[PDB]
Nucleic acid binder design. Sequence first.
RNA 1: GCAAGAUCCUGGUAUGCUGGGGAGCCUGAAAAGGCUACCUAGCAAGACCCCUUCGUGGGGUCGCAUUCUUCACCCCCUCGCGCGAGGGGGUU
DNA 2: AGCTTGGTGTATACCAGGATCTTGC
DNA 3: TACACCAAGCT
Length: 1105
Amino acid sequence: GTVPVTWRLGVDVGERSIGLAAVSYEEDKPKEILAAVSWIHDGGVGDERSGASRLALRGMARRARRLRRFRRARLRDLDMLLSELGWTPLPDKNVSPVDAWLARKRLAEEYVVDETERRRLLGYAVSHMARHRGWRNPWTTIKDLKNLPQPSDSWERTRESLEARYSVSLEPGTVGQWAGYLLQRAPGIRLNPTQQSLSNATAFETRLRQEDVLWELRCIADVQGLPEDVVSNVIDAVFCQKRPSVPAERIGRDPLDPSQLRASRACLEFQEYRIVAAVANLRIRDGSGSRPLSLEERNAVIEALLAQTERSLTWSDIALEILKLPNESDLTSVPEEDGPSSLAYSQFAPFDETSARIAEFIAKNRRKIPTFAQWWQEQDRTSRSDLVAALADNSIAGLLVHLPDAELEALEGLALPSGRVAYSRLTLSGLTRVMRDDGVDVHNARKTCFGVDDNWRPPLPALHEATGHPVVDRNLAILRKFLSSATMRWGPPQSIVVELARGASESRERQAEEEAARRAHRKANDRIRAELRASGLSDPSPADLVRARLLELYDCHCMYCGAPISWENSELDHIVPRTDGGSNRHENLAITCGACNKEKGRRPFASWAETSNRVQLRDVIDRVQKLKYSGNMYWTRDEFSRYKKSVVARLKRRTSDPEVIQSIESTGYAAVALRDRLLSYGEKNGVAQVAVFRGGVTAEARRWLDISIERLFSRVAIFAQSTSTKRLDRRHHAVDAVVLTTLTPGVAKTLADARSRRVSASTEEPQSPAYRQWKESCSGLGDLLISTAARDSIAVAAPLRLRPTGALHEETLRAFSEHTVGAAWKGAELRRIVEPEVYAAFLALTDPGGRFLKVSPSEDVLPADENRHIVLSDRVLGPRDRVKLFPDDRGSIRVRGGAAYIASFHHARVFRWGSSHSPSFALLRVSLADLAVAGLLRDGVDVFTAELPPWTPAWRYASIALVKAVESGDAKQVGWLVPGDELDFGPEGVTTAAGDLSMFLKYFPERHWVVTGFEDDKRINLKPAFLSAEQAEVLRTERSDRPDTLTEAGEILAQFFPRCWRATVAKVLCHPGLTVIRRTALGQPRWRRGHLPYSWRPWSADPWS
RNA sequence: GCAAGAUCCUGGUAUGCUGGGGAGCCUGAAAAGGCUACCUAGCAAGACCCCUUCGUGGGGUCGCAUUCUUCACCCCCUCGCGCGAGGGGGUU
DNA sequence: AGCTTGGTGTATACCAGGATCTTGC
DNA sequence: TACACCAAGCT
Ligand SMILES: [Mg+2]
């Protein structure tokens, strides 16, 4: 069904959104908007406040499980060792709570004569030290831990603070003695400082280290006279830490031999490859030109580089001593940073550094390891390269020599070079063998050995392959679904245009730094706005604010010339002129005095001045170094030191600072990854070109095309001055993408030049034949955009989460309540009955035929019946015998002998009952705990349709009308809803509005809403699909601070958000013509039932099957 | 060659929560309640694998990611000689 | 008595390195 | 953070 049309793809990438457009083109002018959709994604984020991704929380939970399992294994091993030595471990109960601490204190203070008591206290102390060993660097081995200073410096300062606070001298002041003494002397003291939460200083204030516990253990061994073998055994069993590896398939494959794994720095193949390659780059000046060096010369330099032991041969000592030339200037192509007096040659040439390190460590331990040293010197170079490949790559999960526990231990802790070079060791050897013989470079040996063509490149990642970054993977998945659907619809695109708009590769740390920085940017500007308005300024310009800030900080000082200045004597001085490669930044400006202003003369500032009279450097830069931070000004603490060192680094320039550089279309991770994947798709499908722009760019394209979002979507003006931003309406992303289908790199370069000249202040229209051709080609694009916005065609969809995977319950365990069988049972207490079989029995008492429990929470269901017996399957419950109940009347499950609340709901099943002209609706809210305890988290279950038992918290805490209707049999499941489902109320909109919602719909007549939650058994939470919560919160903040900068519509929007429409389900689903819109990847609603989620009407939905 | 970021991954730590305890203090002082700490076990529910002592309990791995679950169709990587496990896509 | 709305609890926070990029000279 | 959950107010 594919009809090939000439169409272009436009992709507007954001942090939380992506706008996607397919626009069909007739004659280099846009003809039809085939699809336009904004997709609102979470950026892969699972913790909404900490910024941690879903993958990060999954990895943290997995590693906590691995930690607990290995810790249990090592405690079992210590228990076996203590049973072997006949030492009693600390029991699980019936002991004093300071037996372990007093045991450590007694064994580290005095000698215990009784053998049984000594062994019991020793077992108690060793078991407790295994439970509380403290932290160690995980990459250090046990000997590396044992060679640390004993005790540590941190514990030494903590100990000195402990005498300075308590005036007692414990010798030796170990952590066990100190903690036990402070518990016996000041009971109820806290040993370690807690998180978050009237004041009490804790006993210790630094994190306990493993060397402190190790020092205490050996001190106990010294005082109690333990033999050294059992001391080493208890040390190895207490401090048994697993080795931090780097597991396989996480290390990149070879571009040339993709079965073979990546190679390391310390692999000798890489040092010899670096030597031969760096030799082969070098061009000897011969024949009045650059001729690459001869074979005898390259063999002499390479043989003189693989046999060294230090960084001895440098680039100034190769050209005139081995290459045999008269001049060091006769050699070129040296891949280092250039400088005067051969600054590249001043550093040292690359050499076999791993062999040097191994030779030096041999020279320090050859008497310790003669077998290794003799094997290293005498055995073959291939075998020793394999040996270093087995000692540097041993820190990988997936020891080839089978040597004993101490003959290799002198080198198991050796620190080799570390890293990952782009080729594999087999490929490095293969390309090595066709350099030192044939004298050809990597550029020829790569073709020769593996038989690849001249135009061969490392292969591009496909669209189906992930990146591992959450934001990039979300944008990538949405992009690849849109592109697959558009390719099946209208064939492959003629071109693909992308632009990213900031917000990547920063963790969203810089999000918090951006908001707390625009806070200062828009607050400290108000001071120099209002005080100059009080002065009398009537023409507001940013330059006046900049010079006012410089006067505010520098206190109106020509620092060089003296002569105190004023507002009129400002003379804003650009340190770097734009004729020498600069830009209009606030770093570049310094306040001057007239005499200290014009004398620079385009020369490097504070360099002509120091090479003259009346003025010198070395003082003012020190004053900037000791600059105290003012708490009320533009620049924050994080930008403070960076600004100060940037000012110093541009003041101390003794040469040029080039140049007038403009961005060259590839700067980010997401841009590189998306570009490579779109190039892979294009080379597999026939796309003529693929470009990835920036900015910033499409806003100016809309400005010079005169395209306004408010004229598109008829939005009200939320600000008093000017109109709203584009970021108010989410559809603007797809609008931008539609505009991105019109551009090329040339017209984008002209627009970027227009941006730099307009912000460098104007206003200036762009002049170019390409720009004029672009402007008269896409003149009708705005007409197309109007006819697309009026038809309600630009969709805003959120991707659905249908997998029944995630946190099943809340983390906090809660104590059970207990209730007697023969008392008065309320509805709440009947709802909280933990045991499902006892629960079903109590339902059989209240309603013998009813499958579900229909009780008011406040109703008194049963009285105190003192002769009530509960007949269970295996036993009988007497009227005085207690029954476990959940602590609160809300959804909870049994986990590990404790009660946990259920998590956020995975979905809500929609139930409809009654007459078709006016039916009632309810939501059965289903969480992950419901499917977990119902046995539905197994492979082969439709979790949105499969029935739940009556004892699940979904059916316990459903609405009463839903329970009665399901008992009556007139209620059927007609669909489900997930957080993110789109509700389309149609042209009618929200007819049943009440309260603030009504006045919200007076100014924002929203017909599309998004399911965001299910706050109780009768209410669904909805937010408007086309309106942005981030824009609404920045208007909320601007109402909280700025005076009357919002219109009444902005007031209503700010008061509506973020809780939005907390709606009664009856009020929502009693709207006729309300539909639940599940969209395809192109934004079109899915209305045909296949094997994908389809649009449905709660009014007109039939039951299942 | 080189200063560094981001993304995870691996190894740990200290609290916290619940169950079992209790050193000190407070109520009860007949009695067992509370608080401050500390000791100990567990810290997703669970699923698969292996024992042989066909049972009785004990060891290993996976388990909050890839947002259209499962089902069904199509493509791709590894192993199979179809198909077991991972990815992807599905137009209204 | 049922719908609007206001407030509030929720596991939490560190360390040392290693592998994929990205950079930006 | 935002969602589920707890009451008070408004009519
Ligand atoms: Mg955008």
